[PDB]
Amino acid sequence: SQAESLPIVSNKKIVFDDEVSIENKESHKELDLPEVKEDNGSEIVYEENTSE
Amino acid sequence: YQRLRHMVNDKFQVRSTGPVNSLTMQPVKGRKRHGGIRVGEMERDALIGHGTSFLLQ
């Protein structure tokens, strides 16, 4: 039965995320960061954690 | 007498304008990167009290 050898997602996931997790860090390692002194004199900073 | 080590911040830090943040626009902490001073939840009230809707603004 075409369901007796049909995979289950729980496990295909664990292989899919793996690679993806890389082509995102690595690809983010071959990228520069262009500062945009947002029309003010300020500075559009490029983070995601101001822990005050 | 004894001279106490520079155990002081002293380092004022002003903020005409400089570094902000991508997700909020509000300037972030710093002191050495000209970080804006925090208007925390306490001072929020203070102003509220007096009745200065503008200073708040």
Across A2-41, b (16+ Cβ under 10 Å) vs e yields: eeeeeeeeeeeeeeeeeeeeeeeeeeeeeeeeeeeeeeee
Contact assignment for B19 to A50 by CB distance below 8 Å: no
Range 3-22 of A in CB contact (< 8 A) with B: none
Say how far apart CA A43 and CA A38 lie, in whole Å.
6
Say how far apart CA A41 and CA A32 lie, in whole Å.
21
Query: CB distance from A45 to chain B under 8 Å?
Result: yes
Residues in A closer than 8 angstroms to B33, CB to CB, are none
Across B16-53, b (16+ Cβ under 10 Å) vs e yields: eebbbbeeeeebbeeeeeebbeeeeeeeeeeeeeeeee
Q: Resolution, rounded to a tenth of an Å?
A: 5.5
Residues in B closer than 8 angstroms to A47, CB to CB, are 21-22, 28
H helices present in chain B, as ranges: 41-50, 53-56
The dihedral sign for the CA sequence A5, A6, A9, A13: positive
Say how far apart CA B21 and CA A44 lie, in whole Å.
6
Instruction: Report residue B54 as tokens.
Output: 């503008």
Q: Exposure of A45 by Cβ count < 10 A (0-12 exposed, 13-18 middle, 19+ buried)?
A: buried
Instruction: Report residue B52 as tokens.
Output: 């200065």
Residues in B closer than 8 angstroms to A43, CB to CB, are 18-20
Say how far apart CA B17 and CA B26 lie, in whole Å.
10
Query: CB distance from B18 to chain A under 8 Å?
Result: yes
The dihedral sign for the CA sequence A9, A15, A21, A26: negative
